[PDB]
């Protein structure tokens, strides 16, 4: 057992250690509450208690691709919406800079296409977009495919005008990932691979409440921690039908045969400056986020 004790100042004795070489940070869209923008599930506050306008006949419909398919006027609406665009990188993002700059960072599988790890300065190598990006876009027929650039999905959003194919009149909806659309190819091909030489799993921001992302805590080693920052535990529940994660694939934090598995509940964003701190690299972060944000200010 590789933890000397399941709490945070374990995971950053742990982290110190010679044997923590290698971390994979897995995130969610918690990570970018504290900068502006709302995650899905929370209640009240969440995206899917917030759709009630497109009268949907439940709000997943939004980010389906057959509800799509048939009516995709109200994800167009959304996305113009979705992207005033003027948002910073919260703490929680640079602390994953700041793996990077101490050469701790395998990777970042990120859940969110608010883009803001690559703002951080987390690079294309550093980071899979496990649910796509809105950078390019194509059309939905499996022959055809075509491919449209950042600019021409922008000027049909703000045209208002439902985007259709140049070339077969079908669909063309910006490369993020809607329920029942595959993966990117770099999430297998890094997966198979990454999670193969991975040392400490790091949680920040989501719910696993979906495949396969949520299979990616069950794919490391059994041996090796994994931390969850969050506001609250995600990864561990009593089985029912309809569960999201496989049998025994879950966190196990609060269980008597419970060993490699810590839960901090509370803002990622103060979760992250007290491991920084116990690591020692409080002013580091700071100072960082300080000059990054004056830094965007002024461009
Ligand atoms: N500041 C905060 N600090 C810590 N945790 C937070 C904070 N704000 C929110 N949380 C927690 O952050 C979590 C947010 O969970 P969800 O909203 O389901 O986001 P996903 O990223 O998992 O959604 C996954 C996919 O589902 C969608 O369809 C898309 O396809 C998404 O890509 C909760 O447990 C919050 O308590
Ligand atoms: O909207 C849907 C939905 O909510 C559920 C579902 C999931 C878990 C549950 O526990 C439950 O009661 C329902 O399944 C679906 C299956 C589909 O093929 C299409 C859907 O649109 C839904
Ligand atoms: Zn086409």
Same mark, same amino acid.
Not at 42 to 46: H, K, Q, R, V
């Given at each position: 057992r590789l933890l000397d004790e399941l709490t945070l100042e374990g995971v950053a004795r742990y982290m110190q250690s010679?044997?923590?070489?290698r971390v994979i940070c897995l995130v969610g869209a918690g990570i970018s509450t504290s900068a502006g923008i709302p995650d899905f599930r929370?209640?009240? /506050?969440?995206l899917y208690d917030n759709l009630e306008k497109y009268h949907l006949p439940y709000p997943e419909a939004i980010f389906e691709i057959s509800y799509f398919k048939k009516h995709p006027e109200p994800f167009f609406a959304l996305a113009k919406e979705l992207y005033p665009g003027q948002f910073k990188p919260t703490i929680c993002h640079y602390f994953m800079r700041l793996l990077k700059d101490k050469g701790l960072l395998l990777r970042c599988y990120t859940q969110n296409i608010d883009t803001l790890e690559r703002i951080a300065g987390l690079e294309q190598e550093d980071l899979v977009e496990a649910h796509g990006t809105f950078y390019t876009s194509h059309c939905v027929s499996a022959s055809c495919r075509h491919e449209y650039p950042l600019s021409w999905m922008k000027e049909k959003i703000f045209s208002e005008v439902t985007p259709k194919c140049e070339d077969c009149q079908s669909l063309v909806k910006p490369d993020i990932v809607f329920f029942g659309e595959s993966l990117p190819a770099r999430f297998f091909s890094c997966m198979q691979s990454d999670f193969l030489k991975v040392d400490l799993l790091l949680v920040m921001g /989501?719910?696993? #409440?979906? #495949?396969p992302f949520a299979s990616l805590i069950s794919k490391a080693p059994l041996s090796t921690p994994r931390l969850l920052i969050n506001k609250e535990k995600a990864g561990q529940s009593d089985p029912f039908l309809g569960m999201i994660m496989g049998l025994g694939g879950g966190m196990d934090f609060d269980s008597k045969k419970a060993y490699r598995d810590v839960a901090w509940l509370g803002e990622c964003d103060q979760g992250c400056l007290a491991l920084a701190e116990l690591l020692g690299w409080k002013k580091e972060l700071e100072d960082l986020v300080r000059r990054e944000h004056a830094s965007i200010d002024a461009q």
């Open positions: 010679e044997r923590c070489r929370s209640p009240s /506050t969440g /989501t719910s696993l #409440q979906v #495949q």
